[PDB]
Structure 1
Amino acid sequence: AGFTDYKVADITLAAWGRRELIIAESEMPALMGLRRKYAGQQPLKGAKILGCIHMTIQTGVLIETLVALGAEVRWSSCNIFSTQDQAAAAIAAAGIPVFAWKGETEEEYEWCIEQTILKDGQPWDANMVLDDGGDLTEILHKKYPQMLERIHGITEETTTGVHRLLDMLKNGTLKVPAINVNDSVTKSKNDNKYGCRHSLNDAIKRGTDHLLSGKQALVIGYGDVGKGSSQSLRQEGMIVKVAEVDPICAMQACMDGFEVVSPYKNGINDGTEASIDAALLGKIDLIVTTTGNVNVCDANMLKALKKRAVVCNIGHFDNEIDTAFMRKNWAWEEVKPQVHKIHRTGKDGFDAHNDDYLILLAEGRLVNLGNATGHPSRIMDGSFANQVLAQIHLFEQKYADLPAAEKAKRLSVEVLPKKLDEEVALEMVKGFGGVVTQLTPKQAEYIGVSVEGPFKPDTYRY
């Protein structure tokens, strides 16, 4: 009532968004357990959180948990295609500043992040950051250093964002401490892997409605996202080949039942067309990049792909695929939003019945969020319970108020303790109806642990 501090696609989608939020709450027991456990204590009272992460229904439940624990927030999406417009509407209709819609331009994307940083044309009195991929973190460091003086910490969601934080820490340019939320086991080995198992084939079906069984796929990378992606396709009956630069991850792909190949003859990427294994790429119906690296589906690979192959990226940024080359050289025919046929016949127009085209999903942006709805609530429950715990921890540490000498001892990128990781996992397991066994005192003593945990040394890899 008099609330205008937002920008969304269509505020009238709010009722729909709220209905899906209420369903999502029943799917996110770890997050709702934190809401119930901490609402009375208000651990985030006084926290003012700049948040930049995909404005989905799942993020909505995270935002309202932070608010329920006392926080104020100003929110944007971390991708131009990942917002669910009904989720953004519901958050805006609840009186929460949010600047996010599906299908932003790059200019609008930056404008949305700035609308969270600035309130009434001046820096918001922010003191906490929640980021997914590091874009908000980067803009604060380059453009708003005086704001970082008063920020107690950053809680970063994803592998690519953690890499950018560690880069800054090594260079001595990180200004506030951070929690690497990504490397909780209930994040990395849940969200990154099983989330992509759920949502990769989901997005490919919604975009193309292609049968996947019996066709050939090439997954580039076999980390947590590549593992999940490869399973998303293999469980549908695809014949999946895996590329990797890490021989340990390649070994896992072999033992998991995949053939390990390289787009390049003998794996040597020398920049020439002659290095492309044209015979291999000429049989591939679907290529998925999962690396967080640059140009792993390059222009020569795109030229060699089988006609009518699907091309998509599920890593954080779109530069995994050389989409710039395709914009320069080939004609783009939009099938529907976030589905384009790329005609390799040339740049100036195309025959509507041309058979030499590729299908690109979400213009090379994160395909699970761009062409579907990303990971499901019950998986994001784990990631976002860690986010809430990470926000509570850094806000209580009050880094910004410490003397310079004490700041120097606390400026780091850390993970949550294993005990908290286990407590998140336990709520997830109970959500499935699973029953964890309790060690007897004898058994606890025998393996050298407390009955309540933690159950594994910090070196353990699961």
Structure 2
Amino acid sequence: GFTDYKVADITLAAWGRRELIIAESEMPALMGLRRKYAGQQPLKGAKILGCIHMTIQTGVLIETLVALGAEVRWSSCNIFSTQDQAAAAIAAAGIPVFAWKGETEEEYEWCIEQTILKDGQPWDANMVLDDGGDLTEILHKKYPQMLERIHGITEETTTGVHRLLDMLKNGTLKVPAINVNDSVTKSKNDNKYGCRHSLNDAIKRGTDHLLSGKQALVIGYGDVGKGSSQSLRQEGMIVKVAEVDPICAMQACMDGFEVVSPYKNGINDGTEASIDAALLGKIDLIVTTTGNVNVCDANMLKALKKRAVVCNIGHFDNEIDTAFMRKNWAWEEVKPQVHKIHRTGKDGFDAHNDDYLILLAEGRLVNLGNATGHPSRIMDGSFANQVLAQIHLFEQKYADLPAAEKAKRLSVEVLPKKLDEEVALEMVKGFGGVVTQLTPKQAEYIGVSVEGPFKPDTYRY
């Protein structure tokens, strides 16, 4: 008689369980943590509010936390990223989850509130796992009393970590956090290689367009932009890259990309005349990867080649001025998460009009919106870090300190390199790779221990 959930179709649970069993074989770091810590139950007593894409991969994470003793209440951190069969499997296992593919904004907020509230009253939560900072923001803004009992936050992604550091500098952060994003086995695995796998995957599922021989513009060349550019280049696209960071621009050049700006001489003054109309007129596909605001703006959208695809793989949809397109242009749904946007007018469209753009996932995270996000074996690294971070913060029991002691432990930290390496070793073994062991004299020669850590904390990999 379990009813504390809300999913699209509970009967998809058996299908979801089949895929969870497969995914478990693809996630050895996470399943190794489950085996190593199951008997010790290091999360016994933890009550975790979780807000992250309700995919099959997140399901393995959820059941790993539960296997270690935790109770959880879960929601997705995006309206399009849930895999309904994963949510169904988690609900059928008796775990409160509120998540389905294609939520409205109102339903998105309701789902988070259903994790926060149990039977109309605040749940006695004491841990937070977030991806992007929406749950974190709601707790600080609307439920500050609940944070008095919460031992910490473990934050998944770059945008969320940015919001956390903003609150820390403004003195508004109420509990300590661990930056899961900046582990090497997260940032340089998930953010880069994950988008390499899943960006062309989403574009093919949404459009079935040939990419070889076509022109792409990738806005940004951080980790997500690096992986995105590779996702397209390996398919044979001619890829151009835009950046505001000269060091990232240098890497793009050395990686074999032409570096261009959508604006003449890189200067974005807000006018149509600043747009490089000749450049945008040749682009078949534009992808935003920045985590910034309005990096594919209304003047760029007006100037893009007819029938160009437009998508975003950064965390929030405001990378693209989709508001401008809702106000001025007529939307034709091809299928879910795929819209033709007719630049001929707002009121109606000719079904055979040739002047349209194709928008994927209404400008929300395209890899999760139009495909299934990152594959299990990549998320294995990110989610082993999440499990380790949850254990660390829960065992430190920040909320039980006196007021004076909380002030001294309020911080945003990363996991130590030794744990990063141990996650990486399990990932390598999952590939069948064999790591060499240093001899004692070789370890002394480079000044490390035989068991690591093998690099100083300044090393960039």
TM-score by length of 1: 1.00
- Report the CA distance between 1:165 and its aligned residue: 0.1
- In structure 2, what is the Cα distance between the partners aligned to 1:200 and 1:331? 26
- Report the CA distance between 1:23 and its aligned residue: 0.1
User: Which contiguous aligned blocks of 4+ residues in structure 1 show a shift greater than 4 angstroms?
Assistant: none
Q: Which residue of 2 aligns with 1:327?
A: 326
- In structure 1, what is the Cα distance between the partners aligned to 2:403 and 2:240? 52
- In structure 2, what is the Cα distance between the partners aligned to 1:411 and 1:440? 41
Question: Deviation string for 1:85-104 (max 9, x for gaps)?
Answer: 00000000000000000000
Q: Which residue of 2 aligns with 1:102?
A: 101
Structure 1 vs Structure 2: percent identity of aligned residues? Answer: 100
- In structure 2, what is the Cα distance between the partners aligned to 1:69 and 1:448? 37
Question: Deviation string for 1:58-103 (max 9, x for gaps)?
Answer: 0000000000000000000000000000000000000000000000
- Report the CA distance between 1:435 and its aligned residue: 0.2
Question: Deviation string for 1:282-334 (max 9, x for gaps)?
Answer: 00000000000000000000000000000000000000000000000000000
- Report the CA distance between 1:415 and its aligned residue: 0.2
- Report the CA distance between 1:361 and its aligned residue: 0.1
- In structure 2, what is the Cα distance between the partners aligned to 1:433 and 1:397? 36
- In structure 2, what is the Cα distance between the partners aligned to 1:247 and 1:294? 19
Question: Deviation string for 1:151-198 (max 9, x for gaps)?
Answer: 000000000000000000000000000000000000000000000000
- Report the CA distance between 1:51 and its aligned residue: 0.0
Question: Deviation string for 1:391-429 (max 9, x for gaps)?
Answer: 000000000001112111110000000000000000000
- In structure 2, what is the Cα distance between the partners aligned to 1:453 and 1:18? 38
Q: Which residue of 2 aligns with 1:33?
A: 32
Q: Tell me the matched-pair count.
A: 461
Question: Deviation string for 1:198-221 (max 9, x for gaps)?
Answer: 000000000000000000000000
Q: Secondary structure at the match of 1:358?
A: strand
Question: Deviation string for 1:364-405 (max 9, x for gaps)?
Answer: 000000000000000000000000000000000000001112
- In structure 2, what is the Cα distance between the partners aligned to 1:413 and 1:282? 44
- Report the CA distance between 1:119 and its aligned residue: 0.1
- Report the CA distance between 1:357 and its aligned residue: 0.1
TM-score by length of 2: 1.00
- Report the CA distance between 1:252 and its aligned residue: 0.2
Q: Secondary structure at the match of 1:129?
A: strand
- In structure 2, what is the Cα distance between the partners aligned to 1:138 and 1:404? 22
Question: Deviation string for 1:244-275 (max 9, x for gaps)?
Answer: 00000000000000000000000000000000
- Report the CA distance between 1:239 and its aligned residue: 0.2
Q: Which residue of 2 aligns with 1:337?
A: 336
- In structure 1, what is the Cα distance between the partners aligned to 2:214 and 2:316? 26
- In structure 2, what is the Cα distance between the partners aligned to 1:260 and 1:404? 52
- In structure 1, what is the Cα distance between the partners aligned to 2:405 and 2:456? 29
Q: Which residue of 2 aligns with 1:216?
A: 215
Q: Secondary structure at the match of 2:450?
A: coil
- In structure 1, what is the Cα distance between the partners aligned to 2:232 and 2:402? 53
Map 1:157-176 onto structure 2 (within 5 A).
157-176=156-175
Question: Deviation string for 1:417-459 (max 9, x for gaps)?
Answer: 0000000000000000000000000000111111010000000
- In structure 1, what is the Cα distance between the partners aligned to 2:401 and 2:428? 39
Q: Which residue of 1 aligns with 2:83?
A: 84
Q: Secondary structure at the match of 1:174?
A: coil
- In structure 2, what is the Cα distance between the partners aligned to 1:70 and 1:440? 40
Q: Which residue of 2 aligns with 1:185?
A: 184
Q: Which residue of 1 aligns with 2:294?
A: 295
- Report the CA distance between 1:143 and its aligned residue: 0.5
- In structure 2, what is the Cα distance between the partners aligned to 1:278 and 1:410? 52
- Report the CA distance between 1:131 and its aligned residue: 0.1
Q: Secondary structure at the match of 2:286?
A: strand
- Report the CA distance between 1:277 and its aligned residue: 0.2
Unpaired segments ≥5 residues, structure 1: none
TM-align CA RMSD: 0.2
- In structure 2, what is the Cα distance between the partners aligned to 1:119 and 1:137? 18
Map 1:281-430 onto structure 2 (within 5 A).
281-430=280-429
Q: Secondary structure at the match of 1:17?
A: helix
Q: Which residue of 2 aligns with 1:115?
A: 114
Unpaired segments ≥5 residues, structure 2: none
Q: Secondary structure at the match of 1:133?
A: coil
Q: Secondary structure at the match of 1:5?
A: coil
- Report the CA distance between 1:281 and its aligned residue: 0.1
- In structure 2, what is the Cα distance between the partners aligned to 1:371 and 1:272? 32
- In structure 2, what is the Cα distance between the partners aligned to 1:336 and 1:83? 17
- In structure 2, what is the Cα distance between the partners aligned to 1:143 and 1:79? 20
- In structure 2, what is the Cα distance between the partners aligned to 1:218 and 1:284? 7
- In structure 2, what is the Cα distance between the partners aligned to 1:246 and 1:403? 43
Q: Which residue of 2 aligns with 1:58?
A: 57
- In structure 2, what is the Cα distance between the partners aligned to 1:389 and 1:446? 32
Q: Which residue of 2 aligns with 1:460?
A: 459
- In structure 2, what is the Cα distance between the partners aligned to 1:325 and 1:362? 16
- Report the CA distance between 1:342 and its aligned residue: 0.1
Q: Secondary structure at the match of 1:186?
A: helix
Q: Secondary structure at the match of 1:319?
A: helix
Question: Deviation string for 1:130-161 (max 9, x for gaps)?
Answer: 00000000000000010000000000000000
Q: Which residue of 2 aligns with 1:140?
A: 139
- In structure 2, what is the Cα distance between the partners aligned to 1:195 and 1:408? 37
